[PDB]
Amino acid sequence: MIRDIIRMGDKRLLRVAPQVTNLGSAELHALVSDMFETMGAAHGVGLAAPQIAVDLQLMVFGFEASERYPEAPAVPLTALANAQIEPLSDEMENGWEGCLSIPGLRAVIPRYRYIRYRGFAPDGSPIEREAEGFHARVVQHEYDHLVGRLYPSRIENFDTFGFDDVLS
Amino acid sequence: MIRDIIRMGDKRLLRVAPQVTNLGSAELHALVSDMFETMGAAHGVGLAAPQIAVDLQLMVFGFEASERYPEAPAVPLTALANAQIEPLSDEMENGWEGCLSIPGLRAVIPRYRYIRYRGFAPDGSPIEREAEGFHARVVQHEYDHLVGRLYPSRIENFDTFGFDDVLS
Numbered sequence: 001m002i003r004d005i006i007r008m009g010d011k012r013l014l015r016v017a018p019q020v021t022n023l024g025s026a027e028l029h030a031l032v033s034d035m036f037e038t039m040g041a042a043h044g045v046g047l048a049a050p051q052i053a054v055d056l057q058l059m060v061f062g063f064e065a066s067e068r069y070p071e072a073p074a075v076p077l078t079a080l081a082n083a084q085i086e087p088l089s090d091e092m093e094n095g096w097e098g099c100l101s102i103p104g105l106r107a108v109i110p111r112y113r114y115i116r117y118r119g120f121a122p123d124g125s126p127i128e129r130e131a132e133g134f135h136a137r138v139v140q141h142e143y144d145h146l147v148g149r150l151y152p153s154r155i156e157n158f159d160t161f162g163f164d165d166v167l168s
Numbered sequence: 169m170i171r172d173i174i175r176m177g178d179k180r181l182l183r184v185a186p187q188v189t190n191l192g193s194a195e196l197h198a199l200v201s202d203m204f205e206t207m208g209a210a211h212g213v214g215l216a217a218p219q220i221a222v223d224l225q226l227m228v229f230g231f232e233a234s235e236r237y238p239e240a241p242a243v244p245l246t247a248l249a250n251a252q253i254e255p256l257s258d259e260m261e262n263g264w265e266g267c268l269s270i271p272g273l274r275a276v277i278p279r280y281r282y283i284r285y286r287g288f289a290p291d292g293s294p295i296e297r298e299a300e301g302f303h304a305r306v307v308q309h310e311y312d313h314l315v316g317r318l319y320p321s322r323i324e325n326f327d328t329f330g331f332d333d334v335l336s
């Protein structure tokens with residue numbers, strides 16, 4: 001079932017989401033199914049549960065290939081609960097992001113180039129991976145959603161903030 | 169003639185505009201006529217020349233009444249060239265702004281509560297006024313456009329940044 005994506009301005013995107021506690025459940029599998037479906041219909045590369053007004057530490061992401069980010073390597077399709085994230089150096093990297101809760105826009109956002117993330121797959125198997133570049137960025141971006149944070153609060157150069165069809 | 173309003177992302181909104189040097193001219197009157205017309209069609213309370221891709225220190229503003237800002241007192245309809253602005257105290261005030269170059273959005277922006285602004289009417293008569301509250305805010309907002317600045321770079325609380333129909 002495709003869910004409605006709530007847009008910036010909605011208080012529900014500003015919450016700190018509680019943990020998932022129903023790993024391996026039919027309810028959770030259904031929710032993640034919906035998230036993948038919803039992410040697909042909106043052409044996202046990630047999607048965070050709060051974006052569909054469900055207050056939980058849960059995200060999905062990945063693609064074989066992206067139209068939006070053609071140079072991006074494949075990122076494994078992943079559903080991740082109770083994510084925690086750790087930078088593996090201080091090195092930052094700028095890159096383009098946009099948000100489905102902020103349709104039509106993008107900006108350049110600095111993110112850690114290298115991270116580790118940990119959590120659980122929906123069946124309850126533990127996940128821990130090191131990630132870099134775009135893979136890392138995506139997970140940081142989704143992580144932010146889980147703590148009530150959106151990319152505009154991280155823009156440093158506002159000359160890069162603009163509409164997709166316009167930006168130059 | 170209604171002009172196209174360029175949207176955030178366009179480099180032309182990021183320029184520092186040169187002075188108007190054709191006060192009292194038919195060309196300038198025509199340009200301001202267009203600006204008032206354009207501002208009217210888009211339901212603005214101000215509009216800055218760079219928003220219609222004309223690189224000049226020129227702005228129009230004012231209304232008898234605003235649907236968008238019903239509590240706002242009338243601000244005199246004004247066309248102002250070569251504006252300069254001076255705060256009259258350090259007191260700041262938060263209020264809602266939106267931008268026609270950023271359709272659909274608004275945020276809370278701190279502005280000087282009290283200013284003086286100076287410049288010329290299109291016929292070349294000098295204008296100097298003291299202004300407060302909403303009158304002041306509008307002129308600051310348009311002034312920003314003339315130096316390559318947009319309101320997102322002044323947002324301090326990003327919880328207030330959001331879509332019009334959503335914000336709560």
Ligand SMILES: CSCC[C@H](NC=O)C(=O)N[C@@H](C)C(=O)O
Nearest residue numbers: 044045046097098099100138141
């Ligand atoms: C590259 S980081 C952006 C990840 C998000 N998911 C957000 O919750 C997107 O898929 N964004 C799309 C819309 C994009 O960047 O164009």
Ligand SMILES: CSCC[C@H](NC=O)C(=O)N[C@@H](C)C(=O)O
Nearest residue numbers: 212213214265266267268306309
């Ligand atoms: C109240 S300050 C906003 C002034 C601008 N003019 C900008 O160049 C507007 O008229 N904004 C409208 C769209 C609004 O605030 O809703």
Ligand code: NA
Nearest residue numbers: 014015148149
């Ligand atoms: Na928040």
Ligand code: NA
Nearest residue numbers: 098104105106
């Ligand atoms: Na975008």
Ligand code: NA
Nearest residue numbers: 182183316317
């Ligand atoms: Na600028």
Ligand code: NA
Nearest residue numbers: 266272273274
């Ligand atoms: Na608005």
